[PDB]
Amino acid sequence: SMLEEIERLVLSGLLTGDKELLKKASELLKEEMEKLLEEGDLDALKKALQLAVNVADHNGDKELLAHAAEVIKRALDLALEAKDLQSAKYLASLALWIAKRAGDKELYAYLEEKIKKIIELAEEAGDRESLKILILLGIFIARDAGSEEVKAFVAEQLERL
Amino acid sequence: MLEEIERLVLSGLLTGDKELLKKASELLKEEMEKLLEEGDLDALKKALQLAVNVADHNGDKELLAHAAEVIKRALDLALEAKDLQSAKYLASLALWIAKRAGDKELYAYLEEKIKKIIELAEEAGDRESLKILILLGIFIARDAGSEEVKAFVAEQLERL
């Protein structure tokens, strides 16, 4: 409900070109993100991070973009302990988008340590279609950043895929 | 088959083999036209995902335009079959290439379809999809400068 109203501000702000509506929506969305982080709401966090990225993609808000990189690190953490393959896949995929758009080396190195666990989550779940996505995500991680222990992990996983 | 085309794109992207990705591009251009003939829209979305992946590394303009061409064909089949989950994927993907390449043709195709595509989401009652679909309409009307579309997404936004 609080998220539905924030979405009502982003949609109207991105329509009328109201730079003040996006400034208020991004500030409320940054605060709302820290709220659902303590509640463990993964489903609503997927929509909040989707709205945050959509705002920063249009107005170039590096502040809201950097804040999204921090909460996506914590939101991806909750998905891994919850063994949620579909949420961990969307979370890590969007994390690469923020890693590529913002050039954050911290979020890139964080993906290097978790890609071994997200891919194993897809292998443990048996979803080969969802695995091919995560295996491709591991290739993009080793391509953009110097991955010494990840490049040999995704390579061996492709043969067994 | 997409299952082996997947194996070539992943191996070429990982080892940097430009000839390997080139070989997948010829197979993708032939597999996409066949996937549209069969009507497999779930598999075509995977081939489209692979097509825009090899093109955004090898710098392919012919295959990317071919992927943008079968997107317009797959969107019509998704509209004739009321496949809301597909039509939302084809349209949202069409905006991806139209934004990075500035293709005025792909943007103009999206103005006429976003009306019938949004109406497909409101008819099914999927409130979680039309909100994504409405956002697709704003970028269509804002980035392409559409006057008749700006009033359409606004009128649908007030009814939310």
Partner: peptide, 8 residues
């Protein structure tokens, strides 16, 4: 997704 959706 790798890439497409709004975004994902």
């Amino acid at each position: 997704x790798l890439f497409x959706x709004l975004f994902x």
